[PDB]
Amino acid sequence: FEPKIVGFCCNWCSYGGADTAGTARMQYPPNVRIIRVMCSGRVNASMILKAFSEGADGVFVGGCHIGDCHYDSGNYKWKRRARFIEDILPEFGIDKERFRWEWISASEGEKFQKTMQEFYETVKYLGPL
Amino acid sequence: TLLQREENIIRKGNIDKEFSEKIKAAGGDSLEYCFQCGTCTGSCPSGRRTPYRVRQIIRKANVGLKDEIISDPTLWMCTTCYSCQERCPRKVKIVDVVKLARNEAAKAGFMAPAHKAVGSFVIKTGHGVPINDATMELRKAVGLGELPPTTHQFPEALEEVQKIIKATGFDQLIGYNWETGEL
Amino acid sequence: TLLQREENIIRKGNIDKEFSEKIKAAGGDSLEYCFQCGTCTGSCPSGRRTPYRVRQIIRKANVGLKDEIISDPTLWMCTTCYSCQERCPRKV
Amino acid sequence: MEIAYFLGCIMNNRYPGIEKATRVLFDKLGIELKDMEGASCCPAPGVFGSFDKTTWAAIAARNITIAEDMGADIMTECNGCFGSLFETNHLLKEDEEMKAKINEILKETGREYKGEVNVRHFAEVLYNDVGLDKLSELVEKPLNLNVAVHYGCHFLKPSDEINIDNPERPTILDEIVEVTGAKSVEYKDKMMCCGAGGGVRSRDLDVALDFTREKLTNMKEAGVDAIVNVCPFCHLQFDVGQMEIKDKFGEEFDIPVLHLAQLLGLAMGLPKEDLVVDAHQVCV
Amino acid sequence: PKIGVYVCHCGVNIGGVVDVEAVRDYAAKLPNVVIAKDYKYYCSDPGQLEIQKDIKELGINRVVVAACSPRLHEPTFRRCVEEAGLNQFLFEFANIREHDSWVHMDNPEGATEKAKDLVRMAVAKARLLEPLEASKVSVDDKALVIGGGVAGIQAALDLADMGFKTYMVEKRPSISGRMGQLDKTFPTLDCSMCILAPKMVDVGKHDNIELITYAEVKEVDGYIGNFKVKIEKKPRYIDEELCTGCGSCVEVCPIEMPNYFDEGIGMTKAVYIPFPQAVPLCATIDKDYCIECMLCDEVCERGAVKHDQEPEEIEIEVGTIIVATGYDAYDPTEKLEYGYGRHTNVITGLELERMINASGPTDGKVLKPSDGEKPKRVAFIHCVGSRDEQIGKPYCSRVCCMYIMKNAQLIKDKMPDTEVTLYYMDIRAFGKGFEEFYKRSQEKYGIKFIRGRPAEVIENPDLTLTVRSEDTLLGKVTEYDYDMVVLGVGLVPPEGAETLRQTIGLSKSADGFLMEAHPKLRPVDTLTDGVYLAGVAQGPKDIPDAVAQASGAAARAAIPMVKGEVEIEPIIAVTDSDVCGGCEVCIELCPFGAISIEEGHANVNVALCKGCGTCVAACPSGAMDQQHFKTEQIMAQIEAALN
Amino acid sequence: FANIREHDSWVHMDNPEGATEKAKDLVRMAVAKARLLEPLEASKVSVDDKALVIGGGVAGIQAALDLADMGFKTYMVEKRPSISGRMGQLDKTFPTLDCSMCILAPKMVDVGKHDNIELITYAEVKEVDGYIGNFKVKIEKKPRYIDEELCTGCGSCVEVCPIEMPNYFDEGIGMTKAVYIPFPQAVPLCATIDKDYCIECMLCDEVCERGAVKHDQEPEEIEIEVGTIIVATGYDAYDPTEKLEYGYGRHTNVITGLELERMINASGPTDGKVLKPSDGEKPKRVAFIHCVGSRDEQIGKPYCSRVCCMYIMKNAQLIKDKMPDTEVTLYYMDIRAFGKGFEEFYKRSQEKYGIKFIRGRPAEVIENPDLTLTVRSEDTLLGKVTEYDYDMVVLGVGLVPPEGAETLRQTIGLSKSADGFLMEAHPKLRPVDTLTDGVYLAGVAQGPKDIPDAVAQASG
C-alpha cells in the first residue's frame, strides 16, 4: 500500500521550509504533493474535503509559525479552520490522523523532513481510506 | 642519558580511536568541541599543586591517547569540584569525561588500595565509613539509637546491597573474595 | 605524593626580568616577537628523542624564567643544526 | 510536612551530633523526619562514581526506592550524598535505557525505581519550605560569632542541573547563617574545594591536606572564629585534617568546625550534650 | 490555451534523478499543450532565447517551466515572457528540483512519477490563468538615515551628494557615534576625531541633509518609495536655532551628572555639550538633574534656554530607509569571576578609550580609579562577552583583538615603562595591515602575549589584581599581579534595538543584529523592500568595512529612487457584485483593512490589499476570489494531484 | 595657510619659546605671501557620465550592475573569455554551505543582458590617459578565432576537437580541448580557440552550423571615453612550490585549497569526487595546513590572507559530508573566524562533523614510499612532536595580487600597499577611493576579503 498525500504550504515559510529540506538534500518519502498558497489563510475546509473525496489518504498543511505570518494574521484563521476540520472529518469515517497541519519556518528543512516521514508512516499504517 | 625514543613523539601506535569513541558514546561527547582555551586548568585547584592538567586530559581524550590517560596517576587528582565545568566557554562536561576516564582506568587495574578498601567497607557493612564503638557510645549517650537505622541495623538491607554489588560485578572489579571476605 | 607547591605554578618570584633584558641586549632580541607557532620544535631532531623543547625555551626566555632555563639539562640537547632558524616564520 | 531522612555514613557514624541537632531542629519546625530503613552509603560519589558508574547508580537508585516506598521526598544534609542521589535521580528520570538497566539490576532485590520522588538539600529545604522569618522567630540565643562559610562543591554545582544559587557568589548559606546572629566573613578563595572530594582524600592525603591548609590560611587571615559547612565529608576533612596538618607540619589553626544544623541548634538554645561536641577532634 | 512546456535538466540536478525525456513526452501528450522542449540551463540566456523564439513562432499563450523553486526564478521567467510579448502572469512554475529530485534520490522511479504529477498539476493551474496588468507606483526620491555614526554619516553624505534629499535621525544630541569616542584608530594609530569631525561638519552644512538629533523614529508605515515616518524630537530645553554652543550655561550650572560620551567615567553639568566637536554645537538640559535654578537662563546672551520646551512630532515621507544604528559595548558585570563593578581597578576597553583620549575626563592620562596614579602593570583580557556559551554569546566581536593591541600600544607610547600583557585565545589580525600591527605590538613596544583564557581575577587587599590563568603554551598555571586590568568587551546591539526593529518590521540574525537579505550577495539589503543596512547595525566590524557598507547601501537605495517607479503584484481579492450578498464576514479578516462596503457589496482597495487570500477562503458563496489563486485553479490542482 | 601645528607645535614641544618664535616667523611669511596674491578664476570641465569596470568577478559584476541600474552606461573589460572570477570556481560558500554558482549565475546573465552594460571579455586595458570625467581608454580585444555574434555555445566543436590542453578554470587539474568553453554557465556562452594548441585541422569549422569559426581573426583595438574607472581585478592563489619542506609539485598527493575546490565541485574535472592524484581513489585521511604563503617572513609574506581559515574549515566540512568515514585534521596557528556566523561555523566543524584541530605550524611533509604523507609538526597544546600519516594533504594557500597586476597599475597610475595590493585613499574613511581622482577600487583588488565584503565595497 502506497498512500496518496496532498500538501498545502504557504509561500513564505512552509514552502520555504520544504525548499530548505531540498537544498540540504534531506530525503523523505515521495508520496506527498505540495500545492503552493501565498498564506495558510488561503486554505479552507473545501480543499481538504475535495482532496479526501478525490482519493487522498492524507492531507498536510504547512504554515508560518504563529506570530511569523507574512500577512501577519493569516495562520490564525487557518488554525481555527483546521480545528473545525478535525472536528468534521471523523464524522465521515476519516481519522483525524490523516489530516496533519504544522507550522514550518522557511529555515526548518529538517523539521519538514521529519514531519513528512512521520506523516507518511502514520498514513501508511492506517491503510487505504 | 636523556634519550628515550618512545616518550617524546606521538605516532598512530600511541592512539586508540576506539577509546575516544567509547568515551564520547558513554556521555563525554562534548569533549569533541573543546577549543583548548585553558580556562579549566586555570580554575583547577589541584592543578596548582600537582602535575594534573585537566585541559591536557581533555586533549588526550580527543586524540585517543588511552594508555597515556588511564595509567596516569594525575588522573586521580581531580576532586570533582566542578569549577572548570561552571566556566568552560564551550560547555564541555569536563567532570563527566574525567569520571569516564577513571572508569576505564579502574577497568585496567589502576585502582589505589585505599579506594578498594572503601569499596570493601561498603560491601561488608553497606557504609563507606562504618561506625566504630566510640561513635556507638556517643550515639547512645545523646538519645539516638546505638546503631543508625541503616544497613548496620537491617541485615536484609545489607544482603540487598551485596546482591546489587554482585550483579554489577563491582566485587570482581576490586578483587573482593567472598569466601574469606578479603581483597 | 604528587604534591609540590612550587613546581606547578608561576608567580613573580620565578621571574627575572634582568635575565630577559640581558639576553635581548646580547643579540637575542628577536625572541621578543616569537608567536609560538611550534615550527621549531617540529623541525628539531633532538626534540624527537629527548625532553628538549626549543619553543618552550624561547617562551621561558621571553617570560624571564632564568632558573628554569639555566639549570635545565635539556638546554644542552641542541646540536645547533639551525633547522629551526631556517624555517621560523618570524625570523627569530 | 513529611520528608524522608537520608543520613549517609559520616554523619551517623562519626558525628552523630549533627544528626541529633537536625532531628531537634526539624521537630521544632513541625517537619516530620521519616527514617529510610535499610539505607546504605549513597554511595560516596568520589570512589564509586570513579570506579563504576553502573554500581554507583544502582546503589543510589535503591536508596531512592527506599524513600519512594514511603511516597516522600528525600532530604539530605551532606553535599556528597545530595550530589550522588540528585545526579542518580535526574539521570534515571531523563534516560529510559539507563533506567531499564538499573531496574534490571534492582529486580533481584525486590525493588523498582519509579522516578516518583525528589532529592532535596537541607539548606534548600530550610530556605524555601521554612523561610528566613520562621528561622529567625526560633532564635533564642543570638550568636556573637565570626564564621567562615564553606559551601562545598556539590551543594550548588553543577548549577545547570541543581539550579539552587549562583555557584560563583552564592548567598543562601550566608543568609541562613546570619539569621542566627553570627556574621559570615568574606575570605580569599571562599568557593574553593576542601580537597576531600573525588576520592582524593583516600588517594593522596597530602594533596587534600594542602587544599585544606590553603583554605585554613585564607580563613585565618580573615580572623574567623569557626567554620560552618553543610557537608559531613567537608566537616571531616576540616576537623581531622587540622589534626593531620598539625602532626605533619606542626601548623596550628584551632578553628572549630560546625555543621549548619549545629550552628542553628546553638542559636536555638539546644542542650549542649545534644550537639555532641565530643565527636569533634578540634575543641569547640 | 496553447501551453508550451519547458523541462529543465539543470545539468544533472534534475536529469540525474528525473528522466527529462519521459517528462517532456508526457507534457507534450497532455491536453492543450502545443510544444514540449527540454534544455540544459533554461534560466541562462540561451534558454530564455529559446522560450522567446517558441512564443513568437508557435504563438504560445501559456508558458509552463518544470525547474527549481518559483521563489528563485519566477521573476526571471516572468520578464522573459514579457520581453516576448506574453503577459507576465500567464506563467506557471513546477518545483521538481527542491521538492522532487533532491529529496527522493533513492527512488528514481517514484521521483519521475512525482515529477509527472507535479507537471500535470502545473498545467492544470496554467489552463485557467488569465492576464493581469500590474500597477506602477511612484518612488519618492527621499531617504531616511537612522543613526549618526560613521556609517550613517557616510550613507547620508553619499545620498546627498547624489542629489537626493536625505533625513538623518539621531537619538543622541550630537552625531559621531562610537568613532568620535575613540582616541586613535588601528592599524595606523591616527586620530579618529581629526578625520571624523570634517565629515560631521559636512553633514551639518549640507543643503540636501536635514539633521534631526536628539530624536527617535516612533512609527514607520507604508512600503518602498512610499514610507510615512513619525519621528519624535525630544525637548532639549535649549533653542537649537539660537544656541551657539559657547558653554557659559555649563560654566554656571551647579548640578553634576554623568556624561554619556565619557562612558560612566566622566562628569558634566545638568546643561551640557557632549564634546567640543559636537554637531550641532548646542546645549542640552537633562531634567532628571536640573533643579530649575535659572542660572543658565541668566548667563545666556542669545536667549536660547527654554525650560518650557515640549517634545515635537515630525512626519516625513521618504522613499528609502537606511538603518545605521551601530552597537553598544558589552556589560561585563555578569562575568562575576572577573569582578567588573566590584574590583576598583577593573575597567573596559571603551572606558580605556575615553581615558587615553586627550579630551577625555582625565586629560589623556591612564590613571588607576583607586588612587589616580599611573599603573605600572596592565593586563588585557580578550573575548570578554564573546565566544562564550556560558552567557549565550557564541560569536566573535571581530574588533576587540585589534583595539586591545592598539590600546596596549598607546599605553606603551604614553608610559614606556609600563608592562602590558594580553590574555588571548586567538589573535584575529585578519584585516589589511593587521598582522603587521600584531607583529609591531611585540617587536617595537614589547607587549607580552599569553595564550590563555583567564580563569579568575582576584582583588588583593592593596587593590592590585591577580590574574589566575593557565599559560597553555607553557602548560602551567600562572598567578600574575597587575595594577590595572582591562576587559576586552565585545559588541552587542544597542539599547532599544528591538523597538526599532519592530517599528520598521525587520528580522534579526542569531547574534541579535539585523539580518541581510542574502549573506553572500546582498549584504546591505533586507527582505523588506526599500530598507537597507549599513555598518555595525548588520553585525560587528571595523570602520572601513562599515564605511564600505554605508556607500553600498547608499547606492542600493539610490537605484530604485533613480528608477522612480515600482511594480505592485496584482495578486489581490476581487468581489463579484452579482454574487456578493454583503454579509461582511470578510472585512474583519483583512489585517490591512482593504475591504469596505459600497452599495451593499464588498469592495477591495488595491493599495491596501496584499494578497494573502484569507478573505477569499472565508467567503462561503465564492463572491470573493483571489487573482492568480482562484478557487477553480486550486481545485484543479487538487484534482490533478490525485487523478 | 600657515602650518604651525605639524611643522611647529607638534615637533618643538620641549622649546615653547622657540615654538612661539617659529610661529611668529611662519605667520609673517604667510602674510608676506598673501600680500601679493590675486584672484584666479577656476575653469570647470564636464564629467562624462560613463564608467569602466575592469574585472568580471563578483565585485566587478556587482559594481557594473549597480552603475547600470543607476542609469550610467558602463563598460566591463574582462581578460578571461567569461566573467565569474573566482566565485564561479567555488563549489559552496562559507558559512552557509550554499552553492556559489546557483547564486552567481543569475548575476552573470544579468550583466550579459543589461542594456546599459557593454561586456568586453577576453580583452585587456592597454592604455589609460586623461583625468576624472575625461578618461581615454585603449582596450585590446584578443582574437577568440570564434565569432561572438554567431557562436551559440552548443559545443560541437569541442566534441570533435582532437587536441587536449589544460582548462584554466580547473586550476591545472582539468583538461579541455584546443577549442573550449570554460564552463557551462559561461557569459558570454562562446567558444575560444587557443592557438598554442590548435593544429588547424578545420574539424571545428566543418562541424559548426552557425559558421562561427574564424581562424583568420585578428586582435581588435577599441577606444572608449569614460568618466570613472573601477578596478576589480581580484587576486591569484599563492603558488606553494617555493615551500620546499611541504613538497608541493614534488609529492603526488599534495594539493592546494583552490584545486580542492575544483575537485569537490560537481561540475569539476572529477565530477565532484575527492580522489587522490596518485591512484584516483578516495583518501581516508586528509590533513589541512593553514597559513601557507601567509604570515611568513621567510617568504616575505607578513600578512594574513583572511579567508583561508574559513574555506579550509568549509572544505573539511564538505569532505566530511561527501565521505563521512574520512578523517580530517587541520594544522593551525590561529583560527580567524571573525565574520558573521564564522565562530558558529568553527564550532560546528567540531561538534557536527568531528574535524580535528591541531594547534601547530607543520615543520615538514614527508612522502613515504607508498605515497602516503607524514606531517611532522609539534602539537603545541600537548607540547610534543607528532608524525601523523595522511592519504592527502591540502595546503591552505593565501591570496596574492593577480598576474599582470603591476602592468595595469602602471597603466592607470595607481599606488600599491605594503602587501602588494592597490592602496586606498584613506585606510579608515575612503576605503574604495584612490588618490587618483575618478578611479575606485572594489573587492580583493584592494586586499584579501570574502565575498560579502567585496560586494559591499563594489556597491560603495
Ligand SMILES: Cc1cc2nc3c(=O)[nH]c(=O)nc-3n(C[C@H](O)[C@H](O)[C@H](O)COP(=O)(O)OP(=O)(O)OC[C@H]3O[C@@H](n4cnc5c(N)ncnc54)[C@H](O)[C@@H]3O)c2cc1C
Ligand atoms: C573600544 C573600541 C575601540 C574601537 N577602535 C576601533 C579602531 O581603532 N578602528 C576601527 O576601525 N574601529 C574601531 N572600533 C569599531 C568601530 O567603533 C565601529 O566599526 C564603528 O563605530 C561602527 O560605526 P556605526 O556607524 O556602524 O555605529 P556607531 O558608531 O555605534 O554609531 C551608531 C549611531 O546610531 C545611533 N543610534 C542608535 N540607535 C538609534 C536609534 N534608535 N535612533 C537613532 N539613532 C540611533 C547611536 O547613538 C550612534 O550615534 C572600536 C570599537 C570599540 C568598542
Ligand SMILES: Cc1cc2nc3c(=O)[nH]c(=O)nc-3n(C[C@H](O)[C@H](O)[C@H](O)COP(=O)(O)OP(=O)(O)OC[C@H]3O[C@@H](n4cnc5c(N)ncnc54)[C@H](O)[C@@H]3O)c2cc1C
Ligand atoms: C579556495 C578559496 C575558497 C574561497 N571560498 C570562499 C567562500 O566560501 N566564501 C567567500 O565568501 N569567499 C570565498 N573565497 C574568497 C572569494 O573568492 C573572494 O572574496 C572573491 O573571489 C573576490 O571577488 P573579486 O571580484 O574581488 O575577485 P575575483 O573573484 O578574483 O575576480 C577578479 C576578476 O578580474 C579579472 N581580471 C584580473 N586581472 C584583470 C585585468 N588586468 N583586466 C581585466 N580583468 C582582469 C579576473 O580574470 C577575474 O575574472 C575563497 C577563496 C579561495 C581562494
Ligand code: SF4
Ligand atoms: S575550559 Fe572548556 S574549552 Fe577551554 S580547555 Fe577546558 S574543556 Fe576545553
Ligand code: SF4
Ligand atoms: S572538577 Fe576536577 S578538573 Fe575541574 S576544576 Fe575541579 S579538580 Fe580541576
Ligand code: SF4
Ligand atoms: S618557529 Fe619561530 S615563531 Fe614559531 S615558535 Fe619557534 S621561535 Fe617562535
Ligand code: SF4
Ligand atoms: S638548532 Fe637544531 S637542535 Fe637546536 S633547537 Fe634548532 S632544530 Fe633543534
Ligand code: SF4
Ligand atoms: S531554471 Fe532553475 S533548475 Fe533550471 S538551470 Fe536554472 S536554476 Fe537550475
Ligand code: SF4
Ligand atoms: S544655551 Fe546660551 S549660554 Fe548655553 S551654550 Fe547655548 S548660547 Fe551658550
Ligand code: SF4
Ligand atoms: S536651570 Fe538646570 S541646567 Fe540651568 S543652571 Fe540651573 S540646574 Fe543647571
Ligand code: SF4
Ligand atoms: S576579535 Fe579577538 S578578542 Fe574579539 S571576540 Fe574575536 S577572538 Fe575574542
Ligand code: SF4
Ligand atoms: S464574505 Fe463574500 S458574500 Fe460576504 S461580503 Fe465578503 S465577498 Fe460578499
Ligand code: SF4
Ligand atoms: S486577500 Fe488578504 S489582504 Fe487582500 S483583502 Fe483579502 S484578507 Fe485583505
Ligand code: SF4
Ligand atoms: S563555434 Fe559553432 S560549434 Fe562551436 S560552440 Fe560556437 S556555435 Fe557551437
Ligand code: SF4
Ligand atoms: S582547428 Fe584547432 S580548435 Fe578546431 S578542431 Fe582542429 S585543433 Fe581543434
Ligand code: SF4
Ligand atoms: S585566515 Fe587563517 S589560514 Fe589564512 S592567513 Fe589568516 S590565520 Fe592563516
Ligand code: FES
Ligand atoms: S504567510 Fe505563511 S502563514 Fe501567513
